[PDB]
């Protein structure tokens, strides 16, 4: 908000599969 | 969003194989 009053909204979705043998 | 209302969307796909012996 100043003295126009800029607004933002964010989403991140981060799956990360893994395997090791 | 200001007081135009810029929007962005991003995707990254990062596989990383590995092996060691």
């Amino acid at each position: 908000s100043t003295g126009n009053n800029t607004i933002d909204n964010g989403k991140t979705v981060n799956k990360s599969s893994n395997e090791s043998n």
Side-chain angles (χ1 to χ4, degrees), chain A:
Chain A
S1 67
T2 57
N4 296 116
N5 53 3
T6 63
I7 295 169
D8 51 351
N9 298 113
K11 302 295 295 295
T12 81
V13 176
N14 192 0
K15 290 183 181 178
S16 67
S17 67
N18 189 358
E19 68 182 1
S20 71
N21 48 359

